[PDB]
Symmetry: C2
Subunit: 255 residues, 2 copies
């Protein structure tokens, strides 16, 4: 188990941000509206988890200085890292700054951001890459967050083959000229190569490891493998960080 | 003066909405550190306000009117100066954006638009710079954080306002925009002040005229719709804005 920012620095891994977990988020005469609860970034802006994401923004602001490419790929070591939380909150935070952001859910097998943004999943990433849908037909707007999104679409029979099609390249090149920041949420590296095939058309790449769940080893093993591939892995993010119990104990099995 | 909708229906002028005045804003209202970067924007501040509910109604009427008519450009002009045309269009922009819709707002009042001041965004690269061929499209499209929609400001006042609107990039812009946004709102200078609305109106698919409660007369309004007619511009109707119930009067004027 990780649990400590410096517990990564020692491995040489640079941590762009440490994000604590929100407890309020676990608690979770006509007029007509839409969408459902809950989106932390807009609901509780003062939240401690959100304030940290802003610090994540300030970090990328520098980091992402003169790289020409404005596509930032977010991925995790393994499943349940809270990477979708980090990425979606980052999108909201950056957009809120008067910035044009495009969020794409590249987890063609298990992306669920359509549920989080309470948006349709009929036309998404898979339909486009397969050639069924034109680009403008798969880009929708997440009202509550104030940014544009592309859901995963209907789970395809050939996830990986689709990610390698030329259309993924056309999309990122196109997207890079129309948005100030393009966030790509991808499957964990320790689960599929997908992040390596897409991480190769991106300027930045941040791996998100969860406090306690991830062993500082795999976060290096993940970055290492993305390095074998042309992927330009910058640092890492420590998500989950939960503290103050006045004792001495945690969790993390040893392999 | 003029107060209806009935007084408007009379001259055949079809009224899509009646927006009451907002006392909550008349006062300007105002219900650590690191603050925002804007000013009071009713649509997101007091959402349940009666002026915003009126706009929602406008949305509904516009939805039926803009029923399978394909062209998604909506031009909102006024009969005369200070008719509240910007409060109306900016509010509608926000409302429609919140329904998970990609919207583009453009200030086509190259001489007195102030929407950049309202959205408190930059005004160095705007419509005028783009129309003159100086700037590029992606350069002039910015994002309004609070509202959640994309905007294009006027830019620096050009020496040849009208000549630029007849350009060619105006059309080129509008049709390009029509393919990347679900809704395109174009704010134009008062019809009885310049010919601009009629030159731009020839590329919009729908047009609305906003008349102010008490300041306008059922005369000048139908006169504007008429001269827009001569130019071959789809003027679907009008909007009564400012309506302040529970009151009286104390002015004077006529023609
Ligand atoms: Cl996840
Ligand atoms: Cl294009
Ligand atoms: Cl005006």
């Amino acid at each position: 188990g990780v649990e400590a920012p410096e517990q990564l620095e020692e491995h040489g891994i640079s941590v762009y941000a440490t994000i604590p977990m929100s407890e309020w988020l676990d608690k979770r005469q006509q007029r007509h509206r839409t969408k459902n609860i809950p989106f932390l970034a807009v609901d509780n802006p003062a939240d401690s988890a959100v304030e940290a994401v802003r610090a994540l923004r300030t970090s990328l602001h520098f980091a992402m200085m003169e790289t020409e490419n404005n596509i930032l790929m977010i991925t995790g070591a393994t499943p349940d890292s809270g990477k979708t939380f980090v990425s979606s909150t980052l999108a909201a935070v950056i957009a809120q700054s008067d910035q044009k952001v495009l969020f794409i859910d590249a987890d063609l097998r298990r992306g669920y951001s359509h549920n989080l943004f309470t948006v349709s999943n009929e036309h998404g990433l898979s339909e486009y890459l397969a050639g069924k849908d034109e680009l403008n037909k798969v880009i929708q707007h997440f009202g509550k967050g104030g940014f544009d999104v592309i859901t995963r679409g209907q789970v395809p029979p050939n996830p990986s083959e689709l990610l390698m099609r030329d259309r993924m390249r056309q999309l990122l090149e196109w997207a890079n000229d129309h948005y100030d920041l393009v966030i790509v949420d991808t499957p964990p590296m320790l689960a599929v190569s997908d992040a390596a095939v897409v991480g190769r058309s991106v300027g930045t790449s941040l791996l998100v490891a969860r406090f306690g769940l991830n062993t500082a080893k795999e976060v290096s093993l993940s970055m290492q493998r993305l390095e074998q591939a042309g992927v330009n892995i910058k640092g890492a993010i420590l998500n989950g960080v939960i503290k103050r119990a006045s004792t001495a104990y945690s969790y993390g099995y040893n392999y």
